[PDB]
Amino acid sequence: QVQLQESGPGLVKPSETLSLTCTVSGFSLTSYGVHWIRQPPGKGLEWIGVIWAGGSINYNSALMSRVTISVDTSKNQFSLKLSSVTAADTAVYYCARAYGDYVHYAMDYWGQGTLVTVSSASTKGPSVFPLAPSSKSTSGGTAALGCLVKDYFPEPVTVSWNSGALTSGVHTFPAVLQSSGLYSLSSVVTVPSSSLGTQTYICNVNHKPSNTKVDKKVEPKSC
Amino acid sequence: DIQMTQSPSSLSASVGDRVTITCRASQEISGYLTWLQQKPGKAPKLLIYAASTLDSGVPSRFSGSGSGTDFTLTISSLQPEDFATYYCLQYTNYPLTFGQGTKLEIKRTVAAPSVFIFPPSDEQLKSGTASVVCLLNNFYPREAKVQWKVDNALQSGNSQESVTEQDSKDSTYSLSSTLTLSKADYEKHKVYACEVTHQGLSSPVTKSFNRGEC
Ligand code: NA
Ligand code: NA
Ligand code: NA
Ligand code: NA
Ligand code: NA
Ligand code: NA
Ligand code: NA
Hints:
Assembly: dimeric
Strand content of chain B: over 45%
CATH topology of the largest domain in chain A: Immunoglobulin-like
Oligomer: heterodimer
Shape of chain A: elongated
Organism of A: Homo sapiens
Keywords: Antibody, Humanized, immune system
CATH class of the largest domain in chain A: Mainly Beta
CATH superfamily of the largest domain in chain B: Immunoglobulins
Helix content of chain A: under 10%
Number of domains of chain A: 2
Distance between the termini of chain B: 62 Å
Order of helices and strands of chain B: EEEEEEEEEEEEHEEEEEHEE
Bound molecules: sodium ion
CATH architecture of the largest domain in chain A: Sandwich
Number of strands of chain A: 20
Largest sheet of chain B: 7 strands, mixed
Number of helices of chain A: 0
Shape of chain B: elongated
Entry title: Crystal structure of humanized 44H10 Fab Version 14
PDB class: immune system
Number of strands of chain B: 19
Order of helices and strands of chain A: EEEEEEEEEEEEEEEEEEEE
CATH architecture of the largest domain in chain B: Sandwich
């Protein structure tokens, strides 16, 4: 099964060099290569370049002077270096499998992408607070509960519930900027209102840029 | 560079409708045109390559045609899970270039929100801040009026809203309104209420609590 997995730094200071790897499995590096694509948040896609199975490289000429692409076939990993980065280079960076000849340069399977934020500011891990279920969050047999994930930088944070066992009815809202310049989001989930005294609910927050992992138990309130 | 021009840039349709998205290339790209689907939060997924070839596993309601400079993506019976942004991509000429994307939004019937409210947690109060969260769950259309009333006084300037993307199964939205006060400000009032007005509600619904009662 074809798999591509990007790995990046999260936060990069301006004018420094961004360094990304893409680790692959499930296909022959003598027959496939990878493209590098990026997507600024909320915008379209921009092809960066491609490295081919024999080592041939093609660049987006707009970025070519700052781009370096390579392969280490012993590690099954490709890499992209982008030098002298600025806020214009903040984006999700994807790698995608490459095949073709000299007339077509096709791509099929993408990795899930890694968000690179270019900022002078320093990273900050979130504070996680319970959104407690109560009669005020109960309609009939359904109760809502959640986690407020507050005051972090940069994006993203990931949120699971009960280590991935609770997925039905989860809404993790898009993050919002606060006037402090830090992000904030909520993850909510609806559960059976009769389960509040028999099932423990724990949100799992991971903020990779600050190497912060929080598990918060959400206990009910009495109103 | 070959400029890829997609139209329309956004598009709303009902479940079951036939929808058509076109891509125009500034130069002849023969048949080397791929269509991609990007669902919110996820990476683009390959739908069609070589203008008309469905990828293994793609539903048959997707279809692609065109040659030269003018290409079309067709969904013959729009399904709720087809909510996404769709991109065309030419790949006969370096640099590879994408269209600007078509965001496909699903029209569904009006659906009322379920309204939930959360008092601030003791942990946060101990740190000097009080966030109050009002939740509108699984509603349609997106337009909603959420008003914070504190002791029957309408608030402004101290709340923020967040809305999810359309649900891939029932096409609804959810929304959060977050009122944030300092602990000192929070402790100056008793009743915290959010009042919700929405097309699906026959009259506005208020969810509230008294500070310190929970
Ligand atoms: Na780096
Ligand atoms: Na583009
Ligand atoms: Na041209
Ligand atoms: Na706080
Ligand atoms: Na709408
Ligand atoms: Na969403
Ligand atoms: Na109403």
